[model samples]
Target: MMTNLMLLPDGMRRWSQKQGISLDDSYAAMTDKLVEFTGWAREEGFTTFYVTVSSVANYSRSEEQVTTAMNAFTEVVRRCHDTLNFNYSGTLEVVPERWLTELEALRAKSDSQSDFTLHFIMGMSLAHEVIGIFNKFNGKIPALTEELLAANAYVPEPVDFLIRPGGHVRMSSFYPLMSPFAEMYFCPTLLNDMTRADFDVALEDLRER
Candidate 1:
């Protein structure tokens, strides 16, 4: 079993594969790369990052499965606590959102150490609450400025760069309402395959821009 709870990343991958959707190995490369990237981003002056991985929703139907995955993921985060140097902020998935509550429970018990603050917004439903607020204010709000939208949403402050590790070059959802002025980097490498060089180049591209 991998250190970060073998049940989660691998199981999610299997469920996705069963649906004929290929995914990178979450255990092998993603686990290590995630920590590395997060650390690097922090070092580069980014205190918080929002990420979306939708596979968890596909596996959310089963409580046993969700429990297993959440426990594993949380445990892995705990094990990597020192290296992570960050706190768990929030998550988004289908069915019940209690899985994130469980993860948060684990985080609450931690006396974590980190020089920077990191609020990770996991899963695709990260913007759901913000979407609802926007819909409610629709015409009532004369103009929706970045600050107003940012107030209701969990977004990286001053979203300077929006990077996509996968080959895809389009927004899964909410392009205009999110990161309108942010620089874009669409890497060919999958998230699991992302290397230090890949991140460096992406950062350098933002610098050049």
Candidate 2:
């Protein structure tokens, strides 16, 4: 069973533009869709759900855009914290103090939940993650092995499957160490426009793999 599902929700801004809606609205809709998608995944007996909320490149966007994205993700955590075991993986130094505090509270609140785990990866990049792992070795350079690298990765489990929406056919620096054997599914539908039908199709495709 492909229980570990990783999702890269790409092109929210483009979806906002295409739908003639504000970025905030678009992201809110995206969050709702994700909630719905997770419900479906759980129904199918998937145990872990990993998603990319923001990447290192997202910080280079406009200040308002970055703030909006973070705020939307905060809402996502708030909405699902009671139902999902919320975990985060990323550089905390770059996050604003207010958002950081709120996220911490939410994570603590969700710690006792257990049916499914939702891991949000924000402010992350493959290069930065690898470098941070290497830093743990200090002056003693140990032999790099697959198990060692996987053990040190942000989310230290191999991804069973990966799904990217919004027409992009790239991984976009997501889960480099954990996704080597993942089954990939790329959908042309924009993030906000994606529905449960698209999700079902992706799962169906993964089943055939």
Candidate 3:
């Protein structure tokens, strides 16, 4: 069983265009799929699920798009708060105070539940994270080892398997340090179009390996 699974959901805009749907609708559909995907992952015995909600570069997109993404993320948390242990990884400074407050409350409310761990990576920048890590030990030069660096990362546990949908074959800066040895599965389906069957296929492939 894969103890840690990382999902890099991509191509939402393209998916929306292909489906002839509004971006808001696309995000809503994606969020719904994510809720189901998390349930499936938990049922598969995955202890930790890391999802890339948005990246720092994503902020460069249109303000409306960013807001839509934020809304979708909040909705996912709200929908899964009852069954999942919710946590966030990455900088929240860019996030609005209102959203931050709401997210904190939701996380606290879900803290009592221990079914599984769900980490939402929002506005995560690998460069920023590395710089922060270095600054953490600024005064003293500790013997820098791979383990030392890994220990300082936001999510220290290494990923066992990673599934990237939307035909993307790259990591897209999703937990580079932790997923050095993770088995990867790239699917051609878009994020909104991905179903349990696609997930099962990925799991089957992992089993074969």
Q: Rate the local accuracy (lDDT) of all candidates.
A: 0.51, 0.80, 0.82
Candidate 2: deviation at residue 102, Å?
1.5
Q: Give all TM-scores, in the order shown.
A: 0.63, 0.91, 0.92
TM-score of 2: 0.91
User: Model 3: clashing residue pairs?
Assistant: none
**Top candidate when judged by lDDT against the true structure:** 3
Superposed Cα deviation of residue 76, candidate 3 (Å): 0.4
Model 2 residue runs over 4 Å out of place are 140-145
Q: Name the lDDT of candidate 3.
A: 0.82
lDDT (0-100) at residue 135 of candidate 1? 76
lDDT of 2 by residue, 1-209 (tens): 44788888778889888889888888888778878777877777888888887777777888898888888888888888997888887766667778889988999999465778888887778888878878876677657778877787877688888888889887776754766788988989887777778888888999898
Which residue ranges in model 3 land beyond 4 Å of their true spot? 145-148
Tens digits of per-residue lDDT, candidate 3, 70-160, equal: 8898899999988779987676676667778888898888855576988887777788788877877787875677877888776668888
Clash tally, candidates in order: 0, 0, 0
Misplaced by over 4 Å in model 1 are 1-25, 55-76, 80-98, 109-115, 123-127, 134-148, 174-178
Q: Worst 10-residue stretch by lDDT in candidate 3?
A: 171-180
> 1 or 2: which has the higher TM-score?
2
* lDDT of prediction 2: 0.80
